[PDB]
Amino acid sequence: NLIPAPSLLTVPLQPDFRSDQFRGRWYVVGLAGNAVQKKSFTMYSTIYELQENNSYNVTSILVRGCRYWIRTFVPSSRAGQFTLGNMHRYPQVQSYNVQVATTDYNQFAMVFFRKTSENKQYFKITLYGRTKELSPELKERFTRFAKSLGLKDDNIIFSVPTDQCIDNS
């Protein structure tokens, strides 16, 4: 059934990842993954608040009014890799990994997410912008990166910008 999840060793990692520069607000400009089946989606934002212990408080803001989804990313072995904090709260989830594949900190990021639940491996990549719009070249780059990971046209979606919720606080 599912497109096989790539190994974390085959997914790029941002070299010399800078947790201080990555912090703050990012807009989800596109999304691709093996559980993405394009039938678009309303843009949501994700705020990475860096803690003293170098974990992130990660708060996503979505349009339903507004929904907030709050979780913690705990640093893993390499800079730019994370696991999901408080795993006991997600009883479906056997493992969960986050990897910042590429970013220039002030414009865009591409982040890889993988999780195992129900003995099935899901993965997704997100195209983040510091604004709600990114260049055609960056959106093309994202598409080609998704396809390099075995994803198809049906698995790749770009979002519809909004001013509701996603700019809150």
Ligand X SMILES: *[C@@H]1O[C@H](CO)[C@@H](O[C@@H]2O[C@H](CO)[C@@H](O[C@@H]3O[C@H](CO)[C@@H](O)[C@H](O[C@H]4O[C@H](CO)[C@@H](O)[C@H](O)[C@@H]4O)[C@@H]3O)[C@H](O)[C@H]2NC(C)=O)[C@H](O)[C@H]1NC(C)=O
Q: How far is the CB of 122 from ligand X (least distance, A)?
A: 25
Nearer to ligand X, 1 or 169 (CB): 169
Q: How far is the CB of 20 from ligand X (least distance, A)?
A: 14
Q: Is 128 annotated as a binding residue?
A: yes
Nearer to ligand X, 44 or 48 (CB): 48
Q: Is 90 annotated as a binding residue?
A: no
Q: Which residues pair with 76 in a beta bridge?
A: none
Residue listed under structure tokens 């910008």: 161
Q: Is 116 annotated as a binding residue?
A: no
- To 5 degrees, how large is the angle CA 114–CA 67–CA 25? 65
Nearer to ligand X, 77 or 169 (CB): 169
Residue listed under structure tokens 């591409």: 110
Q: How far is the CB of 50 from ligand X (least distance, A)?
A: 8
**Residues 122 and 33 sit within 8 Å (Cβ to Cβ):** yes
Nearer to ligand X, 49 or 157 (CB): 49
Question: Hey, what long-range contacts does 82-85 have (CB within 8 A, 24 or more apart)?
Answer: 82/56, 84/115, 85/55
Binding site for ligand X (CB under 6 A): 49, 51, 57
Q: Is 68 annotated as a binding residue?
A: no
Q: How far is the CB of 55 from ligand X (least distance, A)?
A: 8
**Residues 9 and 132 sit within 8 Å (Cβ to Cβ):** no
Closest residue by beta carbon to ligand X: 57
> Position 124: which residue type?
K
Residue listed under structure tokens 């770009």: 158
Feature table: binding site for a carboxymycobactin? 44-46, 115, 124, 128
